[PDB]
């Protein structure tokens, strides 16, 4: 994690870059499988803007195993509380399973942000909740 240094630099805009970098590192520090990615898209009336996001294959445990499921979510600035954009990014050799959590595009359903908002939960807890769901049921179980 040498980019981490350049990361805080790739942002240095967020309300709490430090607090953010600390929240991100914490995540990868808990998983070590995830990786913070950088993205540059337009927003301000169509004006390029730096936006962060987490990506990587989380170690999804099973009844007696632990696979790796890809996930990607956009990290907002600091509102309203957490990033509502949290969807799975499966490959092409996989098989997305439609349900109450997933539709087909691999977009996590439910309000979540408009559910817990204890908040109590944290960036980690967020990816933790999904891991709990992605651990119980197959979010995109692949084939042999």
């Amino acid at each position: 994690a040498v980019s981490e240094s350049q990361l805080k630099k790739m942002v240095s805009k967020y309300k709490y870059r430090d607090l953010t970098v600390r929240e991100t590192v914490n995540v990868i520090t808990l998983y070590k499988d995830l990786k913070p990615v950088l993205d540059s898209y337009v927003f301000n009336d169509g004006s390029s803007r730096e936006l962060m996001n987490l990506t990587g294959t989380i170690p999804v445990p099973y009844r007696g195993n632990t696979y790796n499921i890809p996930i990607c979510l956009w990290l907002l600035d600091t509102y309203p509380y957490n990033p509502p954009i949290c969807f799975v990014k499966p490959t092409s050799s996989m098989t997305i399973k439609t349900g109450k959590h997933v539709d087909a595009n691999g977009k996590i359903y439910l309000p979540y942000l408009h559910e817990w908002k204890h908040p109590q939960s944290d960036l980690l807890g967020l990816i933790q909740v999904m891991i709990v769901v992605f651990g119980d049921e197959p979010p995109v179980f692949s084939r042999p």
Partner: peptide, 9 residues
């Protein structure tokens, strides 16, 4: 590590 995802049954 590659994703793939855990299979069913």
């Amino acid at each position: 590590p590659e994703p793939t995802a855990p299979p069913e049954e």
